Design a protein around this ligand. Structure first.
Ligand SMILES: Nc1ncnc2c1ncn2[C@@H]1O[C@H](COP(=O)(O)OP(=O)(O)OP(=O)(O)O)[C@@H](O)[C@H]1O
Length: 357
Protein backbone atom coordinates (compact mmCIF):
# COMPACT_ATOMS: atom_id res chain seq x y z
CA UNK A 1 0.00 0.00 0.00
CA UNK A 2 1.32 3.41 -1.07
CA UNK A 3 0.18 6.65 0.59
CA UNK A 4 -3.35 6.47 2.11
CA UNK A 5 -6.59 6.25 0.14
CA UNK A 6 -8.00 9.78 0.27
CA UNK A 7 -4.77 11.75 -0.12
CA UNK A 8 -4.18 14.11 -3.06
CA UNK A 9 -1.34 13.19 -5.42
CA UNK A 10 -0.44 16.81 -6.20
CA UNK A 11 2.16 18.61 -4.07
CA UNK A 12 3.29 22.24 -3.83
CA UNK A 13 6.72 23.56 -2.70
CA UNK A 14 5.00 26.25 -0.63
CA UNK A 15 3.61 23.46 1.60
CA UNK A 16 7.17 22.76 2.72
CA UNK A 17 6.49 21.24 6.15
CA UNK A 18 3.31 19.86 7.70
CA UNK A 19 1.72 23.28 7.17
CA UNK A 20 -0.69 23.67 4.27
CA UNK A 21 -0.29 27.25 3.02
CA UNK A 22 -2.07 26.62 -0.27
CA UNK A 23 -4.99 24.23 -0.68
CA UNK A 24 -5.36 22.24 -3.91
CA UNK A 25 -8.13 23.66 -6.14
CA UNK A 26 -9.91 20.28 -6.43
CA UNK A 27 -10.92 20.66 -2.77
CA UNK A 28 -12.75 23.96 -3.31
CA UNK A 29 -16.51 24.54 -3.33
CA UNK A 30 -18.16 24.72 -6.76
CA UNK A 31 -21.49 25.93 -8.14
CA UNK A 32 -23.40 26.77 -11.31
CA UNK A 33 -24.94 30.20 -11.67
CA UNK A 34 -25.70 32.71 -14.40
CA UNK A 35 -25.04 29.95 -16.93
CA UNK A 36 -21.42 29.18 -16.01
CA UNK A 37 -19.42 27.14 -13.49
CA UNK A 38 -17.89 28.93 -10.47
CA UNK A 39 -15.15 28.01 -7.99
CA UNK A 40 -14.59 29.52 -4.54
CA UNK A 41 -11.17 31.02 -3.80
CA UNK A 42 -9.37 30.19 -0.56
CA UNK A 43 -7.79 33.64 -0.51
CA UNK A 44 -10.88 35.82 -0.14
CA UNK A 45 -13.83 33.43 0.00
CA UNK A 46 -15.14 34.87 -3.27
CA UNK A 47 -16.53 33.08 -6.35
CA UNK A 48 -14.62 33.08 -9.64
CA UNK A 49 -15.58 31.73 -13.09
CA UNK A 50 -13.89 28.43 -13.92
CA UNK A 51 -12.95 29.77 -17.37
CA UNK A 52 -10.66 32.75 -17.76
CA UNK A 53 -12.72 33.76 -20.80
CA UNK A 54 -15.70 34.33 -18.51
CA UNK A 55 -13.59 36.17 -15.94
CA UNK A 56 -12.57 38.62 -18.68
CA UNK A 57 -16.03 38.70 -20.23
CA UNK A 58 -17.56 39.81 -16.94
CA UNK A 59 -15.28 42.87 -16.80
CA UNK A 60 -16.65 46.19 -18.02
CA UNK A 61 -14.75 47.71 -20.93
CA UNK A 62 -15.54 51.42 -21.03
CA UNK A 63 -13.51 54.12 -22.75
CA UNK A 64 -12.95 57.63 -21.45
CA UNK A 65 -15.40 59.66 -23.59
CA UNK A 66 -13.72 62.36 -25.64
CA UNK A 67 -16.03 65.37 -25.69
CA UNK A 68 -14.89 68.93 -26.36
CA UNK A 69 -18.07 70.26 -27.98
CA UNK A 70 -20.86 69.65 -25.47
CA UNK A 71 -20.44 71.51 -22.16
CA UNK A 72 -23.86 70.22 -21.10
CA UNK A 73 -22.05 66.90 -20.77
CA UNK A 74 -19.66 68.39 -18.21
CA UNK A 75 -18.77 64.93 -16.89
CA UNK A 76 -16.85 64.14 -20.06
CA UNK A 77 -16.41 67.71 -21.26
CA UNK A 78 -13.03 69.41 -21.71
CA UNK A 79 -12.77 72.69 -23.62
CA UNK A 80 -9.51 71.95 -25.45
CA UNK A 81 -10.50 73.41 -28.84
CA UNK A 82 -10.63 76.86 -27.22
CA UNK A 83 -6.97 77.56 -26.49
CA UNK A 84 -7.87 80.52 -24.27
CA UNK A 85 -9.09 78.26 -21.46
CA UNK A 86 -6.02 76.07 -21.97
CA UNK A 87 -2.90 76.25 -19.80
CA UNK A 88 -0.27 77.52 -22.24
CA UNK A 89 -1.87 75.95 -25.30
CA UNK A 90 -1.96 72.54 -23.62
CA UNK A 91 -5.12 70.73 -24.88
CA UNK A 92 -5.58 68.56 -21.77
CA UNK A 93 -4.78 71.22 -19.15
CA UNK A 94 -7.14 73.92 -17.87
CA UNK A 95 -5.84 77.42 -17.12
CA UNK A 96 -5.98 78.93 -13.62
CA UNK A 97 -8.20 81.63 -12.12
CA UNK A 98 -10.74 81.27 -14.93
CA UNK A 99 -14.02 82.49 -13.45
CA UNK A 100 -16.62 79.89 -14.41
CA UNK A 101 -20.34 79.33 -13.93
CA UNK A 102 -21.71 76.01 -12.64
CA UNK A 103 -25.09 74.33 -12.40
CA UNK A 104 -26.58 72.53 -9.39
CA UNK A 105 -25.89 69.03 -10.73
CA UNK A 106 -22.26 69.99 -11.31
CA UNK A 107 -21.72 71.02 -7.69
CA UNK A 108 -23.28 67.76 -6.49
CA UNK A 109 -21.16 65.62 -8.82
CA UNK A 110 -18.03 67.48 -7.69
CA UNK A 111 -18.95 66.88 -4.04
CA UNK A 112 -19.69 63.22 -4.74
CA UNK A 113 -16.14 62.79 -6.07
CA UNK A 114 -14.67 64.72 -3.14
CA UNK A 115 -16.44 62.36 -0.68
CA UNK A 116 -16.28 59.01 -2.53
CA UNK A 117 -12.73 58.32 -3.67
CA UNK A 118 -13.60 54.89 -5.15
CA UNK A 119 -16.40 56.39 -7.26
CA UNK A 120 -14.00 59.09 -8.44
CA UNK A 121 -11.41 56.51 -9.43
CA UNK A 122 -13.71 54.19 -11.38
CA UNK A 123 -15.60 57.00 -13.12
CA UNK A 124 -12.86 59.48 -14.03
CA UNK A 125 -9.58 57.58 -13.84
CA UNK A 126 -8.10 55.13 -16.32
CA UNK A 127 -5.46 52.57 -17.28
CA UNK A 128 -4.08 51.58 -20.68
CA UNK A 129 -5.41 48.38 -22.22
CA UNK A 130 -2.97 46.67 -24.60
CA UNK A 131 -5.60 46.51 -27.34
CA UNK A 132 -8.87 48.09 -26.18
CA UNK A 133 -6.78 51.17 -25.37
CA UNK A 134 -7.24 53.76 -22.62
CA UNK A 135 -10.28 52.72 -20.56
CA UNK A 136 -11.88 53.48 -17.19
CA UNK A 137 -10.15 51.56 -14.42
CA UNK A 138 -11.95 48.76 -12.59
CA UNK A 139 -10.08 48.69 -9.28
CA UNK A 140 -8.87 45.35 -7.99
CA UNK A 141 -10.31 44.60 -4.54
CA UNK A 142 -7.01 45.36 -2.76
CA UNK A 143 -6.72 48.69 -4.61
CA UNK A 144 -10.23 49.61 -3.50
CA UNK A 145 -9.43 48.73 0.14
CA UNK A 146 -6.09 50.56 -0.02
CA UNK A 147 -7.72 53.72 -1.40
CA UNK A 148 -10.36 53.72 1.33
CA UNK A 149 -7.79 53.24 4.10
CA UNK A 150 -5.32 55.85 2.83
CA UNK A 151 -8.20 58.30 2.60
CA UNK A 152 -9.87 57.57 5.94
CA UNK A 153 -6.80 57.16 8.22
CA UNK A 154 -4.31 59.95 8.94
CA UNK A 155 -1.29 57.66 8.77
CA UNK A 156 -1.03 54.43 6.84
CA UNK A 157 1.78 51.91 6.35
CA UNK A 158 1.42 49.32 3.55
CA UNK A 159 3.38 46.07 3.37
CA UNK A 160 2.90 44.90 -0.22
CA UNK A 161 4.26 42.25 -2.55
CA UNK A 162 5.74 43.08 -5.94
CA UNK A 163 3.96 43.82 -9.23
CA UNK A 164 0.46 44.44 -7.84
CA UNK A 165 -0.13 47.64 -9.79
CA UNK A 166 0.13 49.78 -6.66
CA UNK A 167 1.49 52.88 -8.41
CA UNK A 168 -1.84 53.14 -10.20
CA UNK A 169 -3.70 53.47 -6.90
CA UNK A 170 -1.09 55.77 -5.33
CA UNK A 171 -1.31 58.11 -8.34
CA UNK A 172 -5.12 58.18 -8.14
CA UNK A 173 -5.00 58.84 -4.40
CA UNK A 174 -2.60 61.76 -4.76
CA UNK A 175 -4.55 63.19 -7.70
CA UNK A 176 -7.70 62.99 -5.59
CA UNK A 177 -6.03 64.59 -2.56
CA UNK A 178 -4.78 67.70 -4.38
CA UNK A 179 -7.91 68.10 -6.52
CA UNK A 180 -10.42 68.08 -3.67
CA UNK A 181 -8.49 69.76 -0.84
CA UNK A 182 -7.24 73.34 -0.73
CA UNK A 183 -3.81 74.63 0.31
CA UNK A 184 -2.38 71.13 0.81
CA UNK A 185 1.35 70.75 0.14
CA UNK A 186 2.22 67.14 -0.70
CA UNK A 187 5.75 65.79 -0.58
CA UNK A 188 6.82 62.59 -2.35
CA UNK A 189 10.00 61.02 -0.93
CA UNK A 190 12.04 58.13 -2.33
CA UNK A 191 15.61 56.81 -2.32
CA UNK A 192 16.34 58.61 -5.58
CA UNK A 193 14.77 61.87 -6.70
CA UNK A 194 14.08 60.32 -10.09
CA UNK A 195 11.92 57.71 -8.36
CA UNK A 196 9.77 60.43 -6.80
CA UNK A 197 9.59 62.21 -10.15
CA UNK A 198 8.05 59.06 -11.63
CA UNK A 199 5.37 58.88 -8.95
CA UNK A 200 4.68 62.56 -9.65
CA UNK A 201 4.49 61.88 -13.39
CA UNK A 202 1.87 59.16 -12.89
CA UNK A 203 -0.12 61.55 -10.71
CA UNK A 204 0.11 64.30 -13.35
CA UNK A 205 -1.17 61.85 -15.94
CA UNK A 206 -4.27 61.17 -13.86
CA UNK A 207 -5.00 64.88 -13.44
CA UNK A 208 -4.56 65.50 -17.18
CA UNK A 209 -7.37 63.12 -18.15
CA UNK A 210 -9.82 64.77 -15.76
CA UNK A 211 -12.80 66.71 -17.16
CA UNK A 212 -12.86 70.50 -16.79
CA UNK A 213 -15.17 70.56 -13.75
CA UNK A 214 -13.07 68.13 -11.69
CA UNK A 215 -9.70 69.37 -12.90
CA UNK A 216 -8.29 72.29 -10.91
CA UNK A 217 -6.76 75.23 -12.74
CA UNK A 218 -3.05 74.62 -13.31
CA UNK A 219 -0.68 77.19 -11.83
CA UNK A 220 2.63 75.34 -12.23
CA UNK A 221 3.56 72.15 -14.10
CA UNK A 222 7.19 71.01 -13.79
CA UNK A 223 9.00 67.67 -13.72
CA UNK A 224 9.81 68.11 -10.05
CA UNK A 225 6.56 69.74 -8.91
CA UNK A 226 3.09 71.08 -9.67
CA UNK A 227 0.71 73.67 -8.18
CA UNK A 228 -3.03 74.05 -8.63
CA UNK A 229 -5.50 76.95 -8.44
CA UNK A 230 -6.80 75.70 -5.08
CA UNK A 231 -3.40 76.29 -3.53
CA UNK A 232 -2.50 72.60 -3.32
CA UNK A 233 0.79 71.24 -4.69
CA UNK A 234 3.06 68.22 -4.99
CA UNK A 235 6.84 68.09 -4.91
CA UNK A 236 9.19 65.17 -5.64
CA UNK A 237 12.22 64.80 -3.36
CA UNK A 238 14.98 62.42 -2.38
CA UNK A 239 14.46 61.20 1.18
CA UNK A 240 16.56 63.08 3.76
CA UNK A 241 16.06 65.15 6.93
CA UNK A 242 16.68 68.31 4.91
CA UNK A 243 13.80 67.51 2.56
CA UNK A 244 11.50 66.94 5.54
CA UNK A 245 12.51 70.07 7.48
CA UNK A 246 12.65 72.14 4.29
CA UNK A 247 8.91 72.32 3.64
CA UNK A 248 5.64 72.29 5.62
CA UNK A 249 3.79 69.28 4.23
CA UNK A 250 0.13 68.45 4.81
CA UNK A 251 0.99 65.01 3.45
CA UNK A 252 4.19 63.01 3.03
CA UNK A 253 4.20 59.89 0.86
CA UNK A 254 7.21 57.57 1.09
CA UNK A 255 7.95 55.17 -1.76
CA UNK A 256 9.67 51.79 -1.30
CA UNK A 257 10.54 52.68 2.30
CA UNK A 258 12.30 49.40 3.18
CA UNK A 259 14.84 49.99 0.42
CA UNK A 260 15.92 53.49 1.44
CA UNK A 261 19.49 53.50 2.88
CA UNK A 262 19.87 55.15 6.30
CA UNK A 263 16.15 55.93 6.35
CA UNK A 264 16.45 56.19 10.15
CA UNK A 265 17.50 59.86 10.00
CA UNK A 266 14.56 60.66 7.74
CA UNK A 267 12.22 58.77 10.07
CA UNK A 268 13.45 60.75 13.07
CA UNK A 269 12.91 63.99 11.18
CA UNK A 270 9.35 62.91 10.34
CA UNK A 271 8.37 62.52 14.00
CA UNK A 272 7.81 66.27 14.52
CA UNK A 273 5.71 66.21 11.35
CA UNK A 274 3.60 63.38 12.77
CA UNK A 275 3.13 65.05 16.15
CA UNK A 276 2.53 68.51 14.66
CA UNK A 277 -0.67 70.32 15.56
CA UNK A 278 -1.49 70.58 11.85
CA UNK A 279 -2.38 66.87 11.71
CA UNK A 280 -0.31 65.95 8.66
CA UNK A 281 -0.97 62.71 6.78
CA UNK A 282 1.80 60.16 6.24
CA UNK A 283 1.55 57.27 3.76
CA UNK A 284 4.26 54.63 3.39
CA UNK A 285 4.26 51.80 0.84
CA UNK A 286 6.95 49.20 0.18
CA UNK A 287 7.78 45.51 -0.15
CA UNK A 288 9.78 44.08 2.80
CA UNK A 289 13.57 44.07 3.05
CA UNK A 290 14.42 41.94 6.08
CA UNK A 291 14.47 43.03 9.71
CA UNK A 292 15.53 46.64 9.08
CA UNK A 293 13.91 50.01 9.84
CA UNK A 294 10.66 49.16 8.05
CA UNK A 295 10.15 45.98 10.07
CA UNK A 296 10.22 48.14 13.20
CA UNK A 297 7.69 50.60 11.77
CA UNK A 298 5.46 47.77 10.54
CA UNK A 299 5.55 45.84 13.83
CA UNK A 300 4.67 48.93 15.87
CA UNK A 301 1.65 49.53 13.62
CA UNK A 302 0.47 45.91 13.69
CA UNK A 303 0.99 45.86 17.48
CA UNK A 304 -1.00 49.07 17.83
CA UNK A 305 1.98 50.85 19.41
CA UNK A 306 1.87 53.77 16.98
CA UNK A 307 -0.69 55.91 15.22
CA UNK A 308 -0.21 54.11 11.90
CA UNK A 309 -2.90 51.88 10.41
CA UNK A 310 -1.30 48.79 8.82
CA UNK A 311 -2.43 47.41 5.46
CA UNK A 312 -1.14 44.46 3.49
CA UNK A 313 -1.76 42.76 0.14
CA UNK A 314 0.18 39.87 -1.39
CA UNK A 315 0.54 37.93 -4.67
CA UNK A 316 -3.02 36.54 -4.75
CA UNK A 317 -4.45 40.08 -5.01
CA UNK A 318 -3.79 39.97 -8.79
CA UNK A 319 -6.62 37.67 -9.86
CA UNK A 320 -5.26 36.89 -13.34
CA UNK A 321 -2.69 34.82 -11.44
CA UNK A 322 -5.48 32.53 -10.26
CA UNK A 323 -5.96 31.02 -13.73
CA UNK A 324 -3.45 28.56 -15.18
CA UNK A 325 -1.81 28.25 -18.61
CA UNK A 326 -4.92 26.50 -19.93
CA UNK A 327 -7.12 29.41 -18.84
CA UNK A 328 -8.72 27.35 -16.05
CA UNK A 329 -9.13 28.58 -12.47
CA UNK A 330 -6.67 26.90 -10.11
CA UNK A 331 -6.53 29.50 -7.30
CA UNK A 332 -2.94 30.28 -8.29
CA UNK A 333 -1.56 26.77 -7.88
CA UNK A 334 0.41 26.85 -11.13
CA UNK A 335 1.45 30.51 -11.08
CA UNK A 336 2.99 30.19 -7.61
CA UNK A 337 4.74 26.91 -8.43
CA UNK A 338 6.31 28.39 -11.56
CA UNK A 339 7.32 31.61 -9.77
CA UNK A 340 8.94 29.68 -6.90
CA UNK A 341 10.63 27.18 -9.23
CA UNK A 342 11.99 30.07 -11.30
CA UNK A 343 13.44 31.74 -8.21
CA UNK A 344 13.32 30.18 -4.73
CA UNK A 345 11.08 29.85 -1.68
CA UNK A 346 13.06 32.56 0.13
CA UNK A 347 12.71 35.01 -2.75
CA UNK A 348 9.03 34.13 -3.14
CA UNK A 349 8.29 34.59 0.56
CA UNK A 350 9.90 38.04 0.61
CA UNK A 351 8.85 39.32 -2.82
CA UNK A 352 5.39 37.78 -3.08
CA UNK A 353 4.11 37.04 0.43
CA UNK A 354 5.51 40.18 2.10
CA UNK A 355 7.51 38.13 4.61
CA UNK A 356 10.47 39.55 6.51
CA UNK A 357 12.36 36.25 6.24
N1 LIG B 1 -7.03 47.77 -11.55
C1 LIG B 1 -6.35 47.56 -12.70
N2 LIG B 1 -6.97 47.05 -13.80
C2 LIG B 1 -6.31 46.83 -14.95
N3 LIG B 1 -5.00 47.08 -15.12
C3 LIG B 1 -4.25 47.59 -14.10
C4 LIG B 1 -4.90 47.86 -12.81
N4 LIG B 1 -3.94 48.35 -11.99
C5 LIG B 1 -2.78 48.39 -12.70
N5 LIG B 1 -2.96 47.94 -13.96
C6 LIG B 1 -1.93 47.83 -15.02
O1 LIG B 1 -0.69 47.35 -14.50
C7 LIG B 1 0.41 47.98 -15.16
C8 LIG B 1 1.52 48.31 -14.17
O2 LIG B 1 1.00 49.01 -13.05
P1 LIG B 1 1.96 49.89 -12.09
O3 LIG B 1 2.88 50.72 -12.96
O4 LIG B 1 1.09 50.57 -11.06
O5 LIG B 1 2.85 48.77 -11.36
P2 LIG B 1 3.84 49.16 -10.16
O6 LIG B 1 3.01 49.39 -8.92
O7 LIG B 1 4.76 50.26 -10.64
O8 LIG B 1 4.72 47.83 -9.93
P3 LIG B 1 5.36 46.99 -11.15
O9 LIG B 1 5.85 48.03 -12.12
O10 LIG B 1 6.46 46.20 -10.49
O11 LIG B 1 4.21 46.15 -11.66
C9 LIG B 1 -0.13 49.22 -15.86
O12 LIG B 1 0.20 49.17 -17.25
C10 LIG B 1 -1.63 49.19 -15.64
O13 LIG B 1 -2.35 49.33 -16.87
Amino acid sequence: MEQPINVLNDFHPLNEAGKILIKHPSLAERKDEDGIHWIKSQWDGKWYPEKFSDYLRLHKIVKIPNNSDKPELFQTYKDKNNKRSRYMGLPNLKRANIKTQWTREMVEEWKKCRDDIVYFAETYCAITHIDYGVIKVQLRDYQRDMLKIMSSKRMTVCNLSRQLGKTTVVAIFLAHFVCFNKDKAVGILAHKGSMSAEVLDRTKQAIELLPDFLQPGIVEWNKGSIELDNGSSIGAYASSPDAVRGNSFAMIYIEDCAFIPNFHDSWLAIQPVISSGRRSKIIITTTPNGLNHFYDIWTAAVEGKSGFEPYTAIWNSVKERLYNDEDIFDDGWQWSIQTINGSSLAQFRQEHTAAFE
